[PDB]
Design a protein around this ligand. Structure first.
Ligand code: HDD
Ligand code: HDD
Lengths: 727, 727
């Protein structure tokens, strides 16, 4: 019975459409022509539905899926109802353990290709030829929260890429900041337990704003560098498309000659760097907890494919000890002013998955999954990570056959003597399950290392030392990198770092922990230490005021690539504007607005005080995407109010509040004709203000001004004006 | 090392303390003297820590828990480091599958006691004597969201009680509304899949405001009754302490003489019925996603023990068919005007757990766990539930020995012939593992049914009919219950219902689904259907305007017990007030305010624009709990502003917005002396308005008037005035 509408409006058109224009759908139905070797190889397990009978898992057609079998229509359910028991049994066992960390994440399929051959520095096959494409599957995530927690929390973000290469899977499992909080993997459980919800009551979710986190940080100054990055606006990215990615550790590249080059991996967002502001980010965790998940999915459905440039910081082996920090310490970054990022290739995410659980939830990434041409280093954090990502999926994915789950399967050949395990799919026909064997003439056989298609051989690094549980003395410096980061931020980014620390330490119940953290900031920078202390009602002592600042990092007093905004990198394609309608919209304003937005690939959402439709002055029927309250200004990049019958919305509380929230969060606002009467709500300027576009009508010049503001992301000059506004 | 502060301020006093006064802590350290039989029985597994050496799990003392074992202090980590591998292995497998539904939940320990013996109607031992105390463990929950989702979502809430009786565990697994969405358990996976995050992208979390939910609802009219309850303010409770609890299904009580009485279970909140308003609840999911978990835990630490009265609706076997609805249909409630709730006993929750994972996450409740004196009925939703809750713990809790996990163990004797299974703890010494046996003289033995301490025997209900997969025709009525609920609500409750439907349908992307739900609403009540249609820009057709309304339920046109607020049941103890400080508070106002609140058990939180302290006019040093942005008005029940230097915060945007937010959400606000200058922020007349307390000082009747407002919970008369207001 219950069937599709006559008009076919239940199903999304299979073509690129702007956010909200059609219901979202599984990738293979939304973009059936988008393919790559990995996506094609998943065809053996994709299951359709249209035109097929409803059955049990054993293939028996079901006649009545609305009722249990009972003795009489008001009688007891019978144990012989196997249809009911299979159905409820499968439901009863749907859930698998979520990831220990990074349980909340969003993923997509795409492809990668190098700009030129890197055969002089690496024999890795996926980087050997500019016209050789490698399928990828990428998962972005938060760290602390559960799989059902919110997206726009303040936290480091994960950025994991699975490269399905011809010589094996390579997983590049990184984060959105260039360093980690801790130095040795043995402390991982301590750090993670300290940031996770506290053990007695399991509070708080997705937040480092609580006593145990700041207690750990206060006792472990090695954490201060990554804590600086988390308290800055880097901890609240606007989108997964607008953040950087880093492998953090120094790895090695190995060429066909056997030469090792130290390398740090980078991803540069071709959409530019952009972050929310705290009040915005926190409120958005409640208005739309799935904001980043949704935004990535919709950008891909709209054709705004997330694009990232892979880059390498390369250090010759003979320069291992030439910096004033250890290259193997993951709490230290390598300034781009000392070692530039060489561009390597481009990654494009162009298709969403079909089933989130099957492809995203069960995907398994692991930094140990390297290929010939790559190798590790002794970084003590990376060294212990190698143990954990294989170990954890024995419970998470139920066994050692996790490489047979469709999303994890290599697309290149895989043959060996491993057998059995839970849910074994592969049926081995080799007469032998051991080597050396004569009964199958020793196949499959080992392969000597070589320039291409060779077996994996570890670089023969020289090891000299006693068996010790000891931190290297070279890792014992905790304040110079934090300071380099601080001085490289713009004045408004510095204020937001101060505000992040102040907000988080205000939620620490035990005051001495706050004091201890303030003492640590005084070892980094006294201006920062004093601004935080002032917000906590703390007075620095005379000793604290005399702590000597840490040395500069190799002579650097700042490095602009550490800042999100110092060097302009705005890109408006894929951004979104809210357009506040009225019941008699001036169609000439809307025409000019939409045309200019379209030309720069910026989307719009038409909002009103009710759903349904409104009719413009020329009879155009305008469908409403959402109400003012239903899609708050938190969800858009700018707000435009066209003329028409402004009296209709002039006294609307939500419409006025929409503009006050956008104003507070530093977003560009554009007001045309009678819409300029809303300037009184945002109680400011009469001759106009930088950041507020106004004109008798919406024209080419009005739209050019708005789009120029949007390319600079936010109106930072308005900061001084927002803390009086009651919003 | 000896890291704690010498003043001993790292540790919370072991005595009842108001919310925010000390750091929260494990139940047994916070209230060591609070005991019960179950709490005492868990002492065999409680583990301390103070003064013990740090070890491996095998008991080997660890010397250096800061580093991995490596060859050289900058060398590679060695595989022989078993201390590192055990510690990371345990971390790597910490997580277990979350509950399929009700994954988000907060729990506590308590006790129950009947008011009088109920031996005339049931032989259940826990109900046989007013001096028999039964330990309980209660878990409150949401339904759709994961364990890391937010508390204050719009949804039904779970209310599960484990009764540790002398004759077995009895689990009463109910919800906060008296009916469920569906009639037969076979449809549980369809209904749950429709409400859970959609399968392609796993959005949205914690929300029924999406297409698949409303699609299923539109095609299955049996769901309308519980959907009405969810769309009302019942869907957003202020606290687990202020909501009702229901078993939903008709069960049986069996007495010693073998007589069966039909029974429906109720829990009445002794703190009264109270809910939030949608904008507040939604925003509170961002500002504090753990608000309910937090409020429960803090209530117990403050001595505001959650108290509930167990009540029974009792219906004689001969009256089975005397109502307009089927007693076994879980989508129908039994109006209290037809069958009163008989008061049975009281439950008091008075201790938090020690470890959330061990006691809360691993607890297993199942409605099939009944005891002699209780029995089931043929309700087709309850019949299928009996299969699911034993089945699901085979994956959730790892095996069939889940009754051996400490929190789940019976406190009464358990002996049988069951053996082995994963994680087996009990070591059986019986020579036999089968019966009948002669080798252990048939022990343990079967026990005949009897008045007390007898074996379980099912009531011999007559069963007659053919084996059919058929819904009883008596369940085919879907609109009279929804209509009875609607007519029982106050006018402001009806508006909140209209708003709930309107908001949720506005997030449904496919317009025809909105239209189809509106058509179902037209079968319930025309006023409701017109108001929702108007908010969606939908016009009812002439056919919809003439749909005849469903009949009354057994002659009733309303039942005030269905309303949260029609009949005042206000209780201020355990509520909390925000007090907005300034840098020279009139100490006389604060003395009056705080002492009046304390005499009624109402908590306070002193807020300011920074942390630390402020000094009152007389030199009193005032400790600040949180900033205005740090502890938003969403978290309190009322706001009071004392006189003093009001110029200090008069122009603070946050302080003004604090009042605008509380005013919008209908909370009582009290302004003393010069604090009346904030009247212009919320546009209050010179003469004043009901809901705003104002005077020259906080003396005389100022606090009594504020407390009277708190007793009515919210200022419903202000709704028309908030309509506008930009907040
Ligand atoms: C020693 C243990 C340990 C340490 C020191 C780290 N982590 Fe890790 N991480 C794990 C133990 C692990 C894990 C327990 O193995 C996880 C969750 C389960 C999973 O499959 O892998 C994981 C997941 C995980 C993910 C999610 C992959 C996904 O999307 O499935 C990413 C992005 C990171 N980690 C990144 C980092 C980076 C950049 C680190 C430091 C530089 C780091 N991890 C240190
Ligand atoms: C046939 C399946 C089925 C049906 C029809 C119901 N549920 Fe259920 N529910 C389960 C399948 C289940 C479950 C899969 O077995 C769960 C989840 C995990 C668990 O242990 O139990 C569960 C958990 C569960 C919880 C959580 C207990 C805790 O806190 O752990 C409560 C409060 C409810 N349910 C209440 C209800 C009520 C009042 C129902 C209708 C009257 C309902 N359920 C119908």
């Amino acid at each position: 019975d219950s069937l599709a509408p006559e008009d076919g409006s239940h199903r999304p058109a299979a073509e690129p459409t702007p956010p909200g224009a059609q219901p979202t759908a599984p990738g293979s139905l939304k973009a059936p022509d988008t393919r790559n070797e990995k996506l094609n190889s998943l065809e053996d397990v994709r299951k359709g539905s249209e035109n097929y009978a409803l059955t049990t898992n054993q293939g028996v057609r079901i006649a009545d899926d609305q009722n249990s079998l009972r003795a009489g229509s008001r009688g007891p359910t019978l144990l012989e109802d196997f249809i009911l028991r299979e159905k409820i049994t499968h439901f009863d066992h749907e859930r698998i353990p979520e990831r220990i960390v990074h349980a909340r994440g969003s993923a997509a399929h795409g492809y990668f290709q190098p700009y030129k051959s890197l055969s002089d520095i690496t024999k890795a096959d996926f980087l050997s030829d500019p016209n050789k494409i490698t399928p990828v599957f990428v998962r972005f995530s938060t760290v602390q929260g559960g799989a059902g927690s919110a997206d726009t929390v303040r936290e480091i973000r994960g950025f994991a890429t699975k490269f399905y290469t011809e010589e094996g899977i390579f997983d590049l499992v990184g984060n959105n900041t260039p360093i980690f909080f801790i130095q040795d993997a043995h402390k991982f459980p301590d750090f993670v337990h300290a940031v996770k919800p506290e053990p007695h009551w399991a509070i708080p979710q997705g937040q480092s704003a609580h006593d145990t986190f700041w207690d750990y940080v206060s006792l472990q100054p090695e954490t201060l560098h990554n804590v600086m990055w988390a308290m800055s606006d880097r901890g609240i990215p606007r989108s997964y498309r607008t953040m950087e990615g880093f492998g953090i550790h120094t790895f090695r590249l190995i060429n066909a000659e056997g030469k090792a080059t130290f390398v740090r991996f980078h991803w540069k967002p071709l959409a530019g760097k952009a972050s929310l502001v705290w009040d915005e980010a926190q409120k958005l965790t409640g208005r739309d907890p799935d904001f980043h998940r949704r935004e990535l999915w919709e950008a891909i459905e709209a054709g705004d494919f997330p694009e990232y440039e892979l880059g390498f910081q390369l250090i010759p082996e003979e320069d291992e000890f030439k910096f004033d920090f250890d290259l193997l310490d993951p709490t230290k970054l390598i300034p781009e002013e000392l070692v530039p990022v060489q561009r390597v290739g481009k990654m494009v995410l162009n298709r969403n998955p079909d089933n989130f659980f099957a492809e995203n939830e069960q995907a398994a990434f692991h930094p140990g999954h390297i290929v010939p041409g790559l190798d590790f280093t002794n970084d003590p954090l990376l060294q212990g990570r190698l143990f954990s990502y294989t170990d954890t999926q024995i419970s998470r994915l139920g066994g050692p056959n996790f490489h047979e789950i469709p999303i994890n399967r290599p697309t290149c050949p895989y043959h060996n003597f491993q057998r059995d395990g839970m849910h074994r799919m592969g049926i081995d026909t080799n007469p032998a399950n051991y080597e050396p064997n004569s009964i199958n003439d020793n196949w499959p056989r080992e392969t000597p290392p070589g320039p291409k298609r060779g077996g994996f051989e570890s670089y023969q690094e020289r090891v000299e030392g006693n068996k010790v549980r000891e931190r290297s003395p070279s890792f014992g410096e905790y304040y110079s990198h934090p300071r380099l980061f601080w001085l490289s931020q713009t004045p408004f980014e510095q204020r937001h770092i101060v505000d992040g620390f102040s907000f988080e330490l205000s939620k620490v119940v035990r005051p001495y922990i706050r004091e201890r953290v303030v003492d640590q900031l005084a070892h980094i920078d006294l201006t920062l230490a004093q601004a935080v202390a002032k917000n906590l009602g703390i007075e620095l002592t005379d000793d604290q005021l005399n702590i000597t600042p840490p040395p500069d990092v190799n002579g650097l007093k700042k490095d602009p690539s550490l800042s999100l905004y110092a060097i302009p990198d705005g890109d408006v394609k894929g951004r979104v504007v809210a357009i506040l309608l009225n019941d008699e919209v001036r169609s000439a304003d809307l025409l000019a607005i939409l045309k200019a937005l379209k030309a720069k690939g910026v989307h719009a959402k038409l909002l009103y005080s009710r759903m349904g439709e409104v009719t413009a002055d020329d009879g155009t029927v305008l469908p409403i995407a959402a109400t003012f309250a239903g899609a708050p200004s938190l969800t858009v990049d700018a707000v435009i109010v066209p003329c028409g019958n402004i009296a209709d919305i002039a006294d609307n509380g939500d419409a006025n509040y929409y503009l006050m929230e956008a104003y507070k969060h530093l977003k560009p606002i554009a007001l045309a004709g009678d819409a300029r009467k809303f300037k009184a709500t945002i109680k400011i300027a009469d001759q106009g203000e930088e950041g507020i576009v106004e004109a008798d009508s919406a024209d080419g010049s009005f739209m050019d001004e708005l789009l120029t503001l949007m390319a600079a992301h936010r109106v930072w000059s308005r900061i001084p004006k927002i803390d009086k506004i009651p919003a």
